[PDB]
Every structure is written in structure tokens, then in C-alpha cells.
């Protein structure tokens, strides 16, 4: 039950990093 609760933990970080990337691509396009 721990290995799968950590698949979720990792999934949650990846998903946050994706959103954070999108805000970063946004800054770059905002400076063009």
C-alpha cells in the first residue's frame, strides 16, 4: 500500500512540474 501511495506522490510532483513548466514557457513567450 506504500509503493502505490508513492506512485501517486510521484504522479503529483510530475503534474505540478508540468504546470510550473507551462508558467515558464508563458514567461518566455511573454518576452517575445
Amino acid at each position: 500500500s506504500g509503493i502505490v501511495q508513492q506512485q501517486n506522490n510521484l504522479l503529483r510532483a510530475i503534474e505540478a512540474q508540468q504546470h510550473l513548466l507551462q508558467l515558464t514557457v508563458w514567461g518566455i513567450k511573454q518576452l517575445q
Partner: protein, 36 residues
């Protein structure tokens, strides 16, 4: 320009597909593990 920016935003489509898959597997796995 707004071609490349197409390619990149719609790879970032593909990744948000991969993160789909992973959410669906996470749900299947929880349920399936509760049953064992």
C-alpha cells in the same frame, strides 16, 4: 513562430496524454490492490 510555439504547446498535449494514462493506472491499481 506561432508553428513552433503549435509543436511545443500541443508536446506539452502529449505530456498532459502521458499524465491521462498515469492517473488512470493509479486508479486501476488502487482498486486492484484493495481487492488482493
Amino acid at each position: 513562430w506561432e508553428x513552433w510555439d503549435x509543436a511545443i504547446a500541443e508536446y506539452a498535449x502529449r505530456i498532459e496524454x502521458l499524465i491521462x494514462a498515469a492517473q488512470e493506472q493509479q486508479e486501476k491499481n488502487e482498486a486492484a490492490l484493495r481487492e488482493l
